[PDB]
């Protein structure tokens, strides 16, 4: 005897799977009882979550709108078409000059599909070096020649770096490398870079060497949509992105590509649209995840609202005011400030490693992450932490609140130094000072009470399980 | 001024995005007002949907449980660990002999990660030919040498076929090809094959030529869990799968791999675990989709229930009873029946193509899909349709109901023939008979009223928008 549909199929999660339900409730509390400073994290809207968890997951729709393998896609077609047109509107793109594919499962699938579309296996790519703030999907191999990124397994990558004294991209050494190496593709955009990108100069380098130019704007796509940073669309052939992070949508990916006449120097047009779509499907993916596309469409309408432009503005102002607070304390930021959503904090002048500060923050439910500074590829443990504003800004925090966050980080570094001074620099010694540290418990209590003063998108704090 | 969190972040979808909400409601009606016979389609549970649309989408967790890039993962870790142990339990696997990775975004990402883990670029692969019922991710190039599947772009594939007269896999030609070609990897499992697989024979062939053996059980994983078909685990090195289709979970993928000592063939052990994990991350993916992993963990507990075993039994019985009904009418099935969830209906003896039947069915809200028969790679339009039982079985339909489904299919083919007889064999002529066809409108009405008689998992038909 099969279970009645009502028993297995309509019964709520809280009854069907109390273990999983309970774990989700604990994670919901964790999300609103600490301070989330991971620069790639955000808290998305209830509207997005409702579309994400919907009957849209029940439909196979391999293909493209109006050209599907299977029938019964009349409404899936409308959702994806609306998602795609909203994607162009959100980034102020003319439909005759730009197209977009909204099926990539996530950011890294979007990049690998873009590469597959325009490159052959073993074609050359350059991207921002990982210890300079680049992303894995832009290429990564170890000093021993071990190929880590799929980008470096299936293509030939070479990284470019920041200037090791200023922290800004070294545009002169970028050009020299591109002229020696002759990449078929140059990637710009990154994960841990605190300044804007000079896309115009990347276009000059790509033109001089003969490269395609792609921007991976995952970290700053929300700022791009709000026209709060430079638009990569003015200069790049292809723009990839996640749809979470600062865009505040579901976890998905997008590939934008140029269409129509190629700009003056015969009468040729861009040729990306078909190759891009074909790389995504049939070459690489199966059925699109239509609940993600529906949820993404929701996020993209929200990203076009005046409220979202005000959010991106506030994200930028919060990161600035946090940085200025830290510098007012005598701390060092790479490049001495920020132009986007994050700061990169250089801890080496204090004699600390990023790990020690990350660990102690984590014990206080402040989530940051350790990060290399000035492109240092040394085996030396990374010398900094990366701190982002999107997540707390989404909970409604403004400058005064981010100045308080800086106070908590100040106290965190102070406690880290007191421990290092009492127990010693070596990691084994440092950990001894974390065992039953009262002062850590007071800061942890302090940040929880601060954390609980603010609202939460995505679920109602008032009907949580754990308060 | 930013929007208050309550406005942008807590407001329901129905208010935030009426367009998208309305489209989801129409898709919900479509899903319960027709007959869904796409063999890769299912209807998942509300419990899975509640986990899928949850605050789990807000957390970055690159890495593995207990070895993450970022802090704050204590509950994500417990969810993934429980998902993994539930995955092993669902398929009756000893944890000392088998491990699993549950981060693949979907079926195709799971396969490509498995290949990346155990193969170098351009290594040789064989898989079931697409017109013989294989899947794209197993290798596909065209007659002109055009590499379509990423599997054929980054690796060197060669397909094996069914016997063109019996419809069963040609195990003799498989062995001969494998000995000539010397693949590093042989794939078994497929998308439109109506019989069980002799994994024992694939193991003999793989041992004879020195190949790894992988089973892709996407289509039948639910039947595998319920022990209603042969287990690939007894003979294969690696098993990949989707988590939707007959498993009835969210859209995701899994990679199972052997652990522990190898069978005599030195005290050596299997070496897959670390390579597989590393291929998924950091090589290919970014952050896992924790809402999928949570929903997947729910689905896997559900797949271990006695009700789910009875479901898989019923899926098989319904497909059998449907096939016997069609053959009772003089129709031909490839291999003359089924041993799993689908039948493959050979229409060429009626002088018809799969397209014509698919299109007319689609106009009656019966969703099937056209499919090549007997591995015919000819350019002639495919001569069959593929029909699956999972989706209707999940709405509670039993043998009597699937005999009624065959009646609707009988009437559908009967009208397809009347139209061809009146208007003509060429495609252009056939379409003329679809214009305002009363008899089609009657079958469509008959299908909707039959469809309405059954329940629906995943949402409450009571509170639908469109009734």
* Start-to-end C-alpha separation, chain A: 41
Beta strand B98-101 with B124-128: parallel, antiparallel or unpaired? unpaired
Q: Which of A138, A283, A354, A362 should be substituted to probe chain B, the one whose Cβ sees the most B Cβ atoms within 10 Å?
A: A283
Nearest to A278 by CA among A308, A250, A255: A255
Interface test with B, best of A18, A28, A68, A105 (most B CBs within 10 A): A105
Residues 398-457 of A with CB under 8 A from B: 454-457
Distance of CA B463 to the CA centre of its chain: 30
Asked whether B393 and B315 are in contact (CB, 8 A), the reply is: yes
Query: Which of the residues B129, B216, B228, B237 is marked catalytic?
Result: B216
3-state secondary structure chain A: CCCCHHHHHCCCHHHHCHHHHHHHHHHHHHHHCCEECCCCCCCCCHHHHHHHCCHHHHCCCCEECCEECCCCCHHHHHHHHHHHHHHHHHCCCCCCCEEEECCCCCHHHHHHHHHHHHCCCCCEEEEECHHHCCCHHHCCECCCCCECCHHHHHCEEEEECECCCCCCECHHHHHHHHHHHCCCEEEECCCCCCCCCCHHHHHHHHHHHCCEEEEECHHHHHHHHCCCCCCHHHCCCEEEEECCHHHCCCCCEEEEEECCECCCCCCCECCHHHHHHHHHHHHHCCCCCHHHHHHHHHHHHHHCCHHHHHHHHHHHHHHHHHHHHHHHCCCEEHHHCCCCCEEEEECHHHCCCHHHHHHHHHHCCEECEEECCCCCCCCCCCCEEEEECHHHHHCCCCHHHHHHHHHHHHHHHHHHHHHHHHHCCCHHHHHHCCCCCHHHHHHHHHHHHHHCCCCCCCCCHHHCCCC
Q: Which two tokens stand for residue A29?
A: 């509390």
The whole-angstrom separation of Cα B409 and Cα B389 is: 14
Contact B387, B347 (CB under 8 A): no
**Which positions of A are catalytic?**
60, 62, 216, 242, 245, 251
CB B159 within 8 A of CB B192: no
Q: Which among B126, B185, B195, B137 has a CA at the least distance from the CA of B161?
A: B126
Distance from CA of B28 to the nearest CA of A (A): 6
d(CA A115, CA A113): 5
How far does A126 lie from chain B, in Å, by closest CA?
17
| CA-closest candidate to residue A111, choices A147, A140, A80, A135 | A135
From B52, B148, B283, residue closest to A53, measured CB to CB:
B52
- Identify the closest residue of chain A to B303 by CA–CA distance: A8
Place of tokens 């003056």: A264
- Tell me the chain A residues in contact with residue B47 when contact means C-beta distances shorter than 8 Å: 11-13, 15-17
CB contact under 8 A, A23 and B75: yes
How far does the CA of residue B371 sit from the closest CA of chain A (Å)?
Answer: 11
C-alpha dihedral sign at A135, A139, A144, A148: positive
Distance separating alpha carbons of residues A355 and A434, to the nearest angstrom: 13
The answer to whether A284 and B107 are in contact (CB under 8 A) is no
CB atoms under 10 Å from CB of A134, counted, come to: 28
A251 to B455: CB separation less than 8 angstroms, yes or no = no
Whether residue B41 and residue A60 make contact (CB cut-off 8 A), yes or no, is: yes
Task: Give the CB-side neighbour count of residue A188, counting CA atoms within 13 A.
Answer: 32
Please report residues of A whose CB lies closer than 8 A to that of B59.
Answer: 27, 31, 41
H or E, element range at B72: none
Cα(A313)–Cα(A294) distance, integer angstroms? 26
Within 237-296 of A, beta carbons closer than 8 Å to B belong to: 242, 244, 250-251, 282-287, 289, 291, 294
Give the DSSP H/E element, type plus range, for residue B185.
strand B185-188
Q: For an interface test with B, which of A1, A12, A19, A23 has the most B Cβ atoms less than 10 Å from its Cβ? A: A23
Chain A residue whose CA is closest to B82: A20
CB pair distance less than 8 Å for B396 and A57: no
Q: How far apart are the first and last CA of chain B?
A: 41
Give the DSSP H or E segment for B160.
strand B156-160
CB atoms inside a 10 Å sphere around CB A421: 11
| Interface probe, candidates B3, B9, B63, chain A, greatest A C-beta count within 10 A | B9
Query: To the nearest whole angstrom, how far is the Cα of B81 from the nearest Cα of chain A?
Result: 11
Resolution in A: 1.9
Work out the number of other CB atoms within 10 angstroms of the CB of residue B180: 10
B23 vs A: CB within 8 A: yes
CATH of domain B317-463: 3.90.1150.10
CA A264, A265, A268, A274 dihedral sign is negative
Give the span between the Cα atoms of B439 and B302, in whole angstroms: 42
Q: For residue A150, give the nearest of B75, B137, B284 by CB distance.
A: B284
**Cβ separation A250–B314 shorter than 8 A:** no
Interface of A with B in 158-197 (CB under 8 A): none
A462 touches chain B (CB under 8 A): no
| Distance between A265 CA and the closest CA of chain B, angstroms | 31
Q: Enter the tokens of residue A80.
A: 């994806």
Chain A nearest-CA residue for B295:
A20
- Give the best residue of A5, A151, A361 to mutate against chain B (max B CB count within 10 A): A5
Within B59-110, strands assigned E span 63-64, 67-68, 98-101
- Nearest by CB to A9, from B121, B362, B457: name it: B457
Is residue A264 a contact partner of residue A97, using CB atoms and an 8 Å limit? no
Give the Cα separation of B342 and B387 in Å (integer).
5
**What residues pair up with A242 in beta bridges, in sequence order?**
A253
Give CA–CA dist A54/A70, Å, rounded.
Answer: 20
Neighbour order of strands in the sheet with B156-160: B98-101, B253-258, B238-242, B212-216, B185-188, B124-128, B156-160
In sequence order, the β-bridge partners of residue B100 are: B256
Characterize B317-328 residue by residue with b for buried, 16 or more Cβ atoms within 10 angstroms of its Cβ, and e for exposed.
Answer: ebbbbbbbbbbe
For residue B118, give the 3-state DSSP assignment.
Answer: helix
CA distance B88 to A62: 30
**How far is residue B68 from each of residues A237, A434, B37, B61, B77, measured CA to CA in Å?**
34, 20, 42, 6, 9
**B173 SS3 class:** helix
Residues of A in contact with B367 (CB under 8 A): 70-72
- Give B412's DSSP letter: H
Catalytic residue list contains B69 = no
Question: In chain A, what are the domain boundaries?
Answer: 55-303, 314-463
In this structure, whether the domain defined by A314-463 belongs to CATH 3.90.1150.10 is answered with yes
The H or E element containing residue B116 is: helix B107-118
Contacts of A456 in chain B (CB under 8 A): 5, 9
Note whether A3 contacts B307, CB cutoff 8 Å: yes
Determine the 3-state secondary structure of B382 from DSSP: coil
Determine whether B115 is an active site residue. no
Residues of chain A in contact with residue B396, where contact means CB-CB under 8 angstroms, are 2, 4-5
Query: Is there a catalytic annotation at residue B359?
Result: no
What is the nearest CA distance from A21 to chain B, expressed in angstroms?
Answer: 8
Angle at A124 between CA A120 and CA A129, to 5 degrees: 135
| CB-CB under 8 Å, A58 with B31 | yes
Contact A27, B76 (CB under 8 A): yes
Distance from CA of B264 to the nearest CA of A (A): 32
In degrees rounded to 5, what are phi and psi of residue A422? Answer: -75, -40
Coil, strand, or helix at residue B371? strand
Measured between CB atoms, does B234 come within 8 Å of chain A? no
Cβ-proximal residues to A39 (8 Å cutoff; 6+ apart), any chain? A191, A192, A219, A341, A342, A386, A387, A388, A389, A390
A65: contact with B, CB 8 A cutoff:
no
Q: Which residues of B touch A46 (CB under 8 A)?
A: 9-13, 16
* Chain A, chain B: beta-carbon pairs less than 8 Å apart: 357
Sign of the torsion angle spanned by Cα atoms A393, A398, A399, A404? negative
A152/B20 Cα distance (integer angstroms)? 39
Using CA atoms, how far apart are residues A255 and A216, in angstroms rounded to an integer? 9
Architecture of domain B55-303: 3-Layer(aba) Sandwich (3.40)
Q: State yes or no: is B216 an active-site residue.
A: yes
Nearest to B46 among A9, A56, A291 (CB): A9
Q: Which residues of A touch B37 (CB under 8 A)?
A: none
Chain centroid to CA B76:
27
Two tokens at B114?
């498995």
Cα angle A39, A41, A42; round to 5: 120
Catalytic residue among B62, B77, B198, B448: B62
Q: What's the CA gap between B132 and B134, in Å, rounded?
A: 6
Pick from A10, A30, A284: CB nearest B150: A284
Candidates A56, A24, A42; CA nearest to A342 is A42
Decide if B6 touches A, using CB distance below 8 A: yes
């Amino acid at each position: 005897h099969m279970d009645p549909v009502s028993v297995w199929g309509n019964t709520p999660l809280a009854t069907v799977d109390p273990e999983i339900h309970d774990l989700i409730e604990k994670e919901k509390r964790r999300q609103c009882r600490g301070i989330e400073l991971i620069a790639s994290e955000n808290f998305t809207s209830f509207a997005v979550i409702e579309a994400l968890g919907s009957a849209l997951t029940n439909k196979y729709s391999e293909g493209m709108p109006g050209n599907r393998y299977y029938g019964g896609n009349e409404y899936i077609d409308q959702i994806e078409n609306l998602c795609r047109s909203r994607a162009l509107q959100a980034f102020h793109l003319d439909a005759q000059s730009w197209g977009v594919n909204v099926q990539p499962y996530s950011g890294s699938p979007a990049n690998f599909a873009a590469y597959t579309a325009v490159l052959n296996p073993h074609d050359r790519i350059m991207g921002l070096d990982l210890p300079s703030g680049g992303h894995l999907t832009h290429g990564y191999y170890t000093s021993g020649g071990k190929k880590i990124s799929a980008t470096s397994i299936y293509f030939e990558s070479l990284p470019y770096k920041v200037n090791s004294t200023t922290g800004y991209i070294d545009y002169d050494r970028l050009e020299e490398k591109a002229l020696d190496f002759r990449p078929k593709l140059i990637i710009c955009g990154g994960s841990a870079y605190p300044r804007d990108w000079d896309y115009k100069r990347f276009r000059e380098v790509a033109d001089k060497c003969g490269a395609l130019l792609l921007c991976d704007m995952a970290h700053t796509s929300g700022l791009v949509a709000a026209q709060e940073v430079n638009s990569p669309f003015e200069y790049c052939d292809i723009v990839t992105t996640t749809t979470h992070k600062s865009l505040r949508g579901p976890r998905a990916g997008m590939i934008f590509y140029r269409k129509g006449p190629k700009p003056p120097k015969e009468n040729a047009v861009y040729d990306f649209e078909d190759k891009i779509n074909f790389a995504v499907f049939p070459s690489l993916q199966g059925g699109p995840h239509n609940h993600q596309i529906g949820a993404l469409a929701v996020a993209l309408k929200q990203a076009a609202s005046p409220g979202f432009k005000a959010y991106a503005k506030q994200v930028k102002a919060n990161a600035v005011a946090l940085g200025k607070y830290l510098m007012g304390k005598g701390y060092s930021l790479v490049t001495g400030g920020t132009e986007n959503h994050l700061v990169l904090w250089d801890l080496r002048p204090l004699g600390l490693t990023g790990y020690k500060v990350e660990k102690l923050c984590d014990l206080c439910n402040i989530t940051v992450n350790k990060n290399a500074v000035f492109g240092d590829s040394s085996a030396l443990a990374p010398g900094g932490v990366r701190i982002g504003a999107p997540a707390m800004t989404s909970r409604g925090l403004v400058e005064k609140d981010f100045e308080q966050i800086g106070e908590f980080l100040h106290r965190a570094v102070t406690l880290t130094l007191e421990i290092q001074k009492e127990h010693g620099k070596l990691l084994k010694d440092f950990n001894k000072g974390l065992v039953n540290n009262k002062a850590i418990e007071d800061l942890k209590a302090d940040v929880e009470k601060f954390s609980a003063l603010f609202d939460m998108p995505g679920f109602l704090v008032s009907e949580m399980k754990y308060k």
